[PDB]
């Protein structure tokens, strides 16, 4: 499924991401835009043998189990397939855990580059939340 900007903002707000670990809602919307382009089925294989899954591009070496990654940790205790669902619940619950690991939202490389220190609330502007 490919989400609309405001559609994802509403879904993310319903899953309690607004101000989660001190990050306003617009940071989450911006991160999904630059990570997966709002596509829940986005899958990106890396040269190291790991893959990034779903709307928030969650990594198979540390967070989810895809059974293909050497030295996998599965810190979110979920199959990587659960992160490709049209229902964002599993991706949100794992992102809540990732954001709590020592890096904050910097864990999402695209959030650091494109969203960190910008007017993130423009990503929720015009939405009927």
């Amino acid at each position: 499924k490919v989400f609309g900007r405001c559609e994802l903002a509403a879904a993310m707000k319903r899953h309690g991401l607004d101000n989660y670990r001190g990050y306003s809602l617009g940071n989450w919307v911006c991160a999904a835009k630059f990570e997966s382009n709002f596509n829940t089925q986005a899958t990106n294989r890396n040269t190291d043998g790991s893959t990034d899954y779903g709307i928030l591009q969650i990594n198979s070496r540390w967070w989810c189990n895809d059974g293909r990654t050497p030295g996998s940790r599965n810190l979110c205790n979920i199959p990587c397939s659960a992160l490709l669902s049209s229902d964002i619940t599993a991706s949100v619950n794992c992102a809540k855990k990732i954001v709590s690991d020592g890096n904050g939202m910097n864990a999402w490389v695209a959030w650091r580059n494109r969203c960190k220190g910008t007017d993130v609330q423009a990503w929720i502007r015009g939405c009927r939340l």
Partner: antibody
Amino acid sequence: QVQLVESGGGLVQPGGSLRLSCAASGFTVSSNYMSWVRQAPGKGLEWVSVIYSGGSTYYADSVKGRFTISRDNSKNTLYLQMNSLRAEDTAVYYCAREGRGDSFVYWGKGTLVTVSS
Amino acid sequence: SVLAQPPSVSGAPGQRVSISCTGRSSNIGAGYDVHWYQQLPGKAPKLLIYGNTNRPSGVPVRFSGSMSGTSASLAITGLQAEDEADYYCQSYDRSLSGSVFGGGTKLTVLG
């Protein structure tokens, strides 16, 4: 129009404490990413600490557990509380306002901190 | 080091010079953008290049950035006396959880 004025620097002895201030104008400290960067005499820039617009704080390993970054919204001021100061903490301390991706878009002129017995 | 730069670079007026920035898999190699700073003597650093290639207002076209893999570069064409300064590259390191600076490069304009 955007201005950062730091003060509070001076001489302190090893194990001593000092509090630096950074008075801002032309923007709101509370809704911005603010950082402290230091530079030891004739040395390179060293990132010290950051406070995110949402309140998250991060420190360099060298000052972890000794330095505390904080802000006062009414005074529109940024602080750096430095405790258990060591000789190697001697540097010009700069206050910086971050732009996109922790780029340091605006810098203050710096305040000197000397730690010596 | 977490970001390495040559301690010194020199060129003649009108020459093209480049300053390298070598990172690691936890910073530049992880995909984190490189920023560059120019520090004139007796002055605070000033942003020269942001997000690998962008020039802020007032930075001449003779200053350019490049970035691929674990490394980034700062190129200076038509070198002028006014370019003499200390240059620093900067990124983000996910292993250290914070912003990181290269050791700096002192640029000399010989001639």
